[PDB]
Symmetry: C2
Amino acid sequence: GRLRVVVLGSTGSIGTQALQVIADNPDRFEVVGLAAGGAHLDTLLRQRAQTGVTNIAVADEHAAQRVGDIPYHGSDAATRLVEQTEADVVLNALVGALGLRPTLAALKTGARLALANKESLVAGGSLVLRAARPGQIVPVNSEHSALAQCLRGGTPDEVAKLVLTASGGPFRGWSAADLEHVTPEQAGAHPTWSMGPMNTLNSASLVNKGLQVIETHLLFGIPYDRIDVVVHPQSIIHSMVTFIDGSTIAQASPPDMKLPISLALGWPRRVSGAAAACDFHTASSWEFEPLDTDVFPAVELARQAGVAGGCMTAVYNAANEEAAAAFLAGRIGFPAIVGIIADVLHAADQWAVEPATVDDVLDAQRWARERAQRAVSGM
Amino acid sequence: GRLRVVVLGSTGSIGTQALQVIADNPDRFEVVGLAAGGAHLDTLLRQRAQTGVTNIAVADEHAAQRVGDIPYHGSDAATRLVEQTEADVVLNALVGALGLRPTLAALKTGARLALANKESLVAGGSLVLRAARPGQIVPVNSEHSALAQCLRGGTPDEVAKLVLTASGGPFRGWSAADLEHVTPEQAGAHPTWSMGPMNTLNSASLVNKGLQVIETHLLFGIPYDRIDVVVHPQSIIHSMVTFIDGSTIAQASPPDMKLPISLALGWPRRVSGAAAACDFHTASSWEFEPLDTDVFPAVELARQAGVAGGCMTAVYNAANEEAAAAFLAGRIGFPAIVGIIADVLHAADQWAVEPATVDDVLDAQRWARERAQRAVSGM
């Protein structure tokens, strides 16, 4: 039958790709709602015009002054749309803190939650897990998608290891000496139309993989000591699962986010023709190498934060966002990003308590930001 | 809860490794029967002593005399042992045409058939298939075991292509001209799997992969034009399945037959500690390259034999048995192995009829052997 989809974060990379998948498959999906932040209001209104979907939300009341016929506008417009719209799937592709409440509201409706928003698990942690029922959250990220597919190779009891693949970023194989010279431009700072300035940087620092390890733990309930990372520069294998008998199951495809997006939307049913398959008519090789954790300790720190628990992973992420933004502005050097994450984490044990409310989480991030700010300025 | 296992071909590489798995896992398995040819009486005696199994079959009447109080002796011994032993699983690891009747005996008993004997599927075809219930035949070979695991990645209607991996053999990359003067010593050089001159030769000629394509079609019901072969020299990826969305699911382990054997014996349940897993704290590469179908047409011949159906795959296999023995005996050259197969198949008009009985299969094989001999006499 046809799945009713609410698209939250409709004007971003994931949201617009999802809308293409939906447009290509009207047999499988219909859009029933759209939510955006306000900065790309003209895109959202063009989406209303094209899809015929009048059920739209704009978070920015000031931006909403421009339109006059938005049913939901202002702070928590996306949450109210989720609360009041009948749907089968909520795609949460909102960015940052504003994704958290809509995740919670979506879980409450009982819909499937196709999750792209990182803050929901990384910051929200136990608030989100306590609210979610088994299998309700389907991840959109290609690594987590790969894991969800490979886990079909046995029972939960048969799992020995989850193995996440990492590109290695631009500085794969570089020494600690090399990393001292890293400029913002080298670490992927360009005014790219597509993605956030932090996405390329987090991949270079290995914080992205740290964040993915944390999400892997919460999604699949596997201990941090059984979650491994391997470097794989080709990015064809998106992740693997090792089972108790010694067998490893891996998922492979040429990079294309429409594959994991389509599957997240249609879960558990695959969507015919979503992506190109691996072609074996031409020679290739898939390479693996250990991550140098002495030079790139960002994953080890993510495990330390995750094992600590509570609001510690929110601290890790908020410390990163401040330090990484500081590097991009020329206030610190590249090695200091993860250096500062560590120093803030090591002073953050008051935050190991479990959050009771969204505000608890917001309080931890606030503390982490200003702690990171002090470490940057030397104050 | 404990599965009773008959091991046919116990003294071979597969049989010995199977008994090791059974010994390591006494709460999952027990041996209740053994059958051997009579070439390795030293091993059989030890197996009797270690397992305490006196319920044994020996093919050679001489060898059965030496061993002492063997309840089944002669060429029908293995078949009679199966017919009369209460068991849950029958492991058929017999070599060549000897495996067929025990295979049919085993299926008529209702036991799971853990199948290593290629002949009984390749030659037996629909005669074997009609005797089996859905999922009664569970494959022992690395490639088919990988496929079975990978097929868990989706529903049957979601399967686009099965991809079998080939090592390429010692002559991977070689010229047709280069093949002209290959000797039996070069063809038996560095065995990837733990088996003798015959199985090593079939890896080198690509006939083994052709037989495995036939088995794949019969085991999984996938059309020949949807079964692909890729060359992968490392032999870590054992096979793959491509799904209709563009996702490929692959299985990987360091070469070790104990893994597929243990999963064949315990299907659907994985056996803890069966084999060592891929170690992703060490660098490695998985290489892929296309097969040179011009220099190696054996797989295409197997497809053509398979498409014709009936007793034609029995013709393909018997023609190989005969040309291969002639190569090993110094009578013909290497390129003549597959040249004779092509010649026999071209003359095999009448063998496209489906076998009603074992004797139909035997008729075809008998004819193929004679026709292969006439092809050898002409060189």
